[PDB]
Design a protein around this ligand. Structure first.
Ligand SMILES: [Zn+2]
Ligand SMILES: [Zn+2]
Ligand SMILES: [Zn+2]
Ligand SMILES: [Zn+2]
Ligand SMILES: [Zn+2]
Length: 143
DNA sequence: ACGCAGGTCCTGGACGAATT
DNA sequence: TAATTCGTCCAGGACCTGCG
């Protein structure tokens, strides 16, 4: 108010060209925080610090119930729902319930019938890239 | 058998909150 | 207040497991 600079990638507005230039890094990766180990780039230094633990194996979020540790507090939170039998995610179509939000989302795809992963050796189609990977191991053990 | 699908936890982009 | 950094949500994914 007013803002006359716009990003030609996402359309966001800025009052100063310096602000647009800074923002434009999320699209080009130029000068985004760079991991000294793998040299990948991240949105802010907090996401970089989070990624650092993928190289060290540090798992700083421990479950006080069973003692297992997790890389992220969100993962620990999801894990604790297992102990407590808390399944707040349900398929609206068949009523199946899950403690894990990704298990629920993955399950719901099955009601679409889509099988976009086709074995390049025999043409068998799978809903899950998982199942195709495992399926291809059978072709290799056959050869 | 092995296709199928749920269990589990890792990874990081998205976005508002908190801090500087 | 603006910029940076943080916490968190949430989508997507990899590897595991057991059932029909
Ligand atoms: Zn943009
Ligand atoms: Zn790295
Ligand atoms: Zn636990
Ligand atoms: Zn369902
Ligand atoms: Zn095949």
């Amino acid at each position: 108010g007013s803002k006359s600079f716009t990003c030609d990638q996402c359309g966001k507005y800025f009052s100063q060209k310096r602000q647009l230039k800074s923002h434009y890094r999320v699209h080009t990766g130029h000068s985004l925080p760079e991991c000294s180990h793998c040299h990948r780039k991240f949105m802010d230094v907090s996401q970089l610090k989070k990624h650092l633990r993928t190289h060290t194996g540090e798992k700083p979020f421990t479950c006080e119930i069973c003692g297992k540790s997790f890389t992220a507090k969100s993962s620990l939170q999801t894990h604790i729902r297992i102990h407590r039998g808390e399944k707040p995610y349900s398929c609206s179509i068949c009523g199946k319930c899950f403690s894990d939000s990704s298990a629920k989302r993955r399950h719901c795809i099955l009601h679409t019938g889509k099988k976009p992963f086709s074995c390049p050796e025999c043409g068998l189609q799978f809903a899950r890239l998982d199942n195709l990977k495992a399926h291809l191991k059978i072709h290799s053990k056959e050869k």
